[PDB]
UniProtKB/Swiss-Prot annotation:
One of its GO terms (biological process) is defense response to Gram-positive bacterium. Lysozymes have primarily a bacteriolytic function; those in tissues and body fluids are associated with the monocyte-macrophage system and enhance the activity of immunoagents. This is Lysozyme C. One of its GO terms (cellular component) is extracellular space. The gene is LYZ. It comes from Homo sapiens (Human). InterPro entries: Glyco_hydro_22, Glyco_hydro_22_CS, Glyco_hydro_22_lys, Lysozyme-like_dom_sf.
Length: 130
C-alpha cells in the first residue's frame, strides 16, 4: 500500500507515534517519505553486507527483523521481515518504536539525518488534522 500524506499522518497518530520518545509526528512522516515514499512494500537490497531494508520505514534485516537469508543477523523486533511488508503498519510501527528506544533515537536512520534533521518539517503534517 502507498499511503497518501495525511492518511499516513492520522494512521501513525492513532498508533501512538506523536511524541514517542520525544519524536514528533512530522519527523516520522519525513522519515517515511524519504525512506519509502510512504510505500509499505518498499524493499532495498544491500549487496555490501547482504542485508535488506523492509517496508515503509526501511527497517534493516541485520538487526531488526528475521528473513533467514541475512548472514549473522539478529531480530531485535522479534518479527518476520514479512510483517514489515503488510498494508497494515501496526507491526512496522511497533518495530520503529523499538528502534528508537536505543541510544540514537530517531538518528538511527541515516536518511532522517540527511533530509529531516534540522530541517523545516512542518509541511509533512499541515492540513492533516493531527
Amino acid at each position: 500500500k502507498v499511503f497518501e500524506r495525511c492518511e499516513l499522518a492520522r494512521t501513525l497518530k492513532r498508533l501512538g507515534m506523536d511524541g514517542y520518545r520525544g519524536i514528533s509526528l512530522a519527523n516520522w512522516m519525513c522519515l517515511a517519505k524519504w525512506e519509502s515514499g510512504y510505500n509499505t512494500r518498499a524493499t532495498n537490497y544491500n549487496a555490501g553486507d547482504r542485508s535488506t531494508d523492509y517496508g515503509i520505514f526501511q527497517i534493516n534485516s541485520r538487526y531488526w527483523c528475521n528473513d533467514g537469508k541475512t548472514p549473522a543477523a539478529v531480530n531485535a523486533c522479534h518479527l518476520s521481515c514479512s510483517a514489515l511488508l503488510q498494508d497494515n503498519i501496526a507491526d512496522a510501527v511497533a518495530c520503529a518504536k523499538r528502534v528508537v528506544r536505543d541510544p540514537q533515537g530517531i538518528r538511527a536512520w541515516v536518511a532522517w539525518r540527511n533530509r529531516c534533521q534540522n530541517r523545516d518539517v512542518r509541511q509533512y503534517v499541515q492540513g492533516c488534522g493531527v
